[PDB]
C-alpha cells in the first residue's frame, strides 16, 4: 500500500521496497541522481556529546542497514590488546583482569594512530605511532587510623578499590609532543577493575592498539547504533465520547490527544508510539483504525562509547561504504 | 593492482556475457544487499542476487543476468558508480545539515 507497512494483529504486511523497473508495466523507479538528490532529506532532532537522534528520509532499508552494520562492526577504535603482568596477588585471575582491561574504553581519538602490521616480530611490531602504553600499580594496605571496626572496605583499607582512572598514560618517543594537549584517559573513569585486600598488589603494562569491532566487541565505538521506522496511525470514524479516553489509553501517554470541546480524538504525536498493537485486542476499534509504519522514513539513534562523536561515527560509516564501493570499482576483474 | 578481490566465476558465466557471477573476497551482506538493490534499478537487469556460501569463509557470490542490451560486467560497474554517487549525496546532505545545525 504505497510504502506504508501494514501492522495487523497476527502478521506484518508490505515489507519490501517495490520500486524498480520490473514491478509493473511502466518501467518507472529507475535510478538517477538529481531525483534522489531532491527526495533525500536529513532532519536532526537532537544532539549531544555521546548522542545523536537524527532522521533519514527517502532511502532504502538496504542502505540504512548498511550504515547501521558499518557503524556497529566496521568503524575502528582503540582498546588494550596485550597486558603484561609483573605482579598479581588478587583473587581475580590474570586472564580475567586482562579481559576486563581490554573491555575498558579509552578516550583517544583515532586517526592519530596507525595500523599495526602483523607480519612483523614483537620487538619491532610496536612503535610510537602504532601503540599507546598504559600502566597500573596499586598496593592495598591496612588503614593507619582509628575508626570503629566492622566497617566497609573503603575507610578500613588503603586503595582497596581499583578503578579505570588508575591507568596512567606513559608517552613514548614522539608522543610527548603530539599527545601533549590530549592525554589519553578512560572515557568512563569509575569502572571497577578489581578489588583487593591488604598485602595484595597489582602491577602491569597495557599496549593499546587500533582495532575493528568485527574482530572483538571491545573495539566497537557505539554502545548501540540502530534505527526505527516512523509509526503511522490512521483514524477514521470519529471516536468521540467515553470510548475516546479508552482508545487514548491504548497508546503511550503523549501519542494521541482528545479535543475538549469537539470530544473527539486525533493523532497528537507519532514518534512516541511503540507499536504494541494493543488497539487490536478490542474489536470495537476493529474498523476505526489502521496502524502502519513508513518504509522510507528511518529514525536513527546513536550512542557513542566515548572516544569519537556520534556524528563523526555516522559520517565515517557513510565514507567507509563509499570507499569500499570505490575500491571494488577500481580493482581489476580477474577471470 | 589487487588482482584477487574480484574473480569472474567462468563456469557460471555464459557466452556473450549477458549473465555472469562474481566472487568478492572480504565482503558480506553489508555490501551485497546495497549493491544488489542499486543494480536492480538498472532498466536492463533481469536477475540480481547474492549469497554467502559459508559463514566460515569470507566470500560473497553475486549473480547478474541482463537482457541483450548490456552485459553483466557493465551492469556491475554501473551499479558500483551509482552506489558511490548515492553515498556522495548522503554525505553532502548530512554535512550541510550538521554545519547549519
Amino acid at each position: 500500500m504505497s510504502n506504508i507497512v501494514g501492522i495487523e494483529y497476527n502478521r506484518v504486511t508490505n515489507t519490501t521496497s517495490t520500486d524498480f523497473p520490473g514491478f509493473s508495466k511502466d518501467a518507472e523507479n529507475e535510478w538517477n541522481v538529481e531525483k534522489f538528490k531532491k527526495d533525500f532529506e536529513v532532519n536532526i532532532s537532537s544532539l549531544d556529546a555521546r548522542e545523536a537522534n537524527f532522521d533519514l528520509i527517502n532511502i532504502d532499508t538496504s542502505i540504512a542497514n548498511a550504515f547501521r552494520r558499518i557503524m556497529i562492526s566496521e568503524v575502528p577504535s582503540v582498546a588494550a590488546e596485550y597486558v603484561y603482568f609483573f605482579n598479581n596477588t588478587s583473587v581475580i585471575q590474570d586472564e580475567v583482569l586482562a579481559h576486563r582491561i581490554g573491555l575498558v574504553p579509552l578516550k583517544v581519538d583515532p586517526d592519530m594512530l596507525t595500523w599495526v602490521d602483523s607480519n612483523l616480530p614483537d620487538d619491532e611490531k610496536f612503535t610510537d605511532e602504532n601503540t599507546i602504553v598504559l600502566s597500573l600499580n596499586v598496593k592495598c594496605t591496612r588503614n593507619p587510623d582509628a575508626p570503629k571496626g566492622s566497617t566497609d572496605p573503603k575507610e578500613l583499607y588503603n586503595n582497596a578499590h581499583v578503578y579505570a582512572r588508575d591507568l596512567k598514560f606513559e608517552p613514548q618517543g614522539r608522543q610527548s609532543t603530539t599527545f601533549a594537549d590530549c592525554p589519553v584517559v578512560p572515557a568512563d573513569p569509575d569502572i571497577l577493575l578489581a578489588k583487593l585486600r591488604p598485602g595484595q598488589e597489582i602491577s602491569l603494562k597495557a599496549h593499546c592498539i587500533l582495532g575493528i569491532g568485527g574482530d572483538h566487541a571491545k573495539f566497537s565505538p557505539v554502545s548501540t547504533a540502530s534505527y526505527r521506522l516512523l509509526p503511522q496511525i490512521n483514524i477514521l470514524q470519529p471516536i468521540k465520547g467515553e470510548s475516546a479516553r479508552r482508545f487514548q489509553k491504548c497508546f503511550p501517554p503523549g501519542v494521541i490527544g482528545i479535543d475538549e470541546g469537539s470530544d473527539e480524538a486525533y493523532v497528537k504525536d507519532a514518534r512516541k508510539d511503540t507499536v504494541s498493537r494493543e488497539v487490536l485486542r478490542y474489536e470495537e476499534f476493529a474498523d476505526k483504525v489502521k496502524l502502519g509504519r513508513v518504509r522510507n522514513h528511518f529514525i536513527f539513534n546513536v550512542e557513542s562509547a566515548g572516544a569519537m562523536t556520534p556524528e563523526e561515527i555516522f559520517f565515517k560509516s557513510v565514507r567507509i561504504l563509499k570507499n569500499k564501493a570505490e575500491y571494488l570499482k577500481n580493482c581489476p576483474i580477474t577471470q | 593492482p589487487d588482482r584477487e578481490k574480484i574473480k569472474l566465476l567462468t563456469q557460471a558465466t555464459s557466452e556473450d556475457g549477458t549473465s555472469a557471477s562474481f566472487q568478492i573476497v572480504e565482503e558480506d551482506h553489508t555490501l551485497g544487499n546495497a549493491l544488489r538493490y542499486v543494480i536492480m534499478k538498472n532498466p536492463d537487469v533481469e536477475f540480481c542476487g547474492y549469497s554467502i556460501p559459508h559463514p566460515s569463509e569470507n566470500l560473497l557470490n553475486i549473480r547478474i543476468q541482463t537482457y541483450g542490451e548490456t552485459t553483466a560486467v557493465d551492469a556491475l560497474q554501473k551499479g558500483l558508480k551509482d552506489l558511490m554517487d548515492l553515498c556522495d549525496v548522503v554525505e553532502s546532505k548530512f554535512t550541510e545539515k550538521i554545519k547549519s545545525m
Binding site: P110, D111, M112, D117, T309, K316, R319 | T95, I98
Partner: peptide, 16 residues
C-alpha cells in the same frame, strides 16, 4: 556539532 571530518585527515580508514 563540529564537522571535524572535512578538516582532519583520517588515517584509521586508510586500509592496511
Amino acid at each position: 556539532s563540529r564537522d571535524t571530518w572535512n578538516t582532519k585527515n583520517m588515517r584509521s580508514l586508510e586500509p592496511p
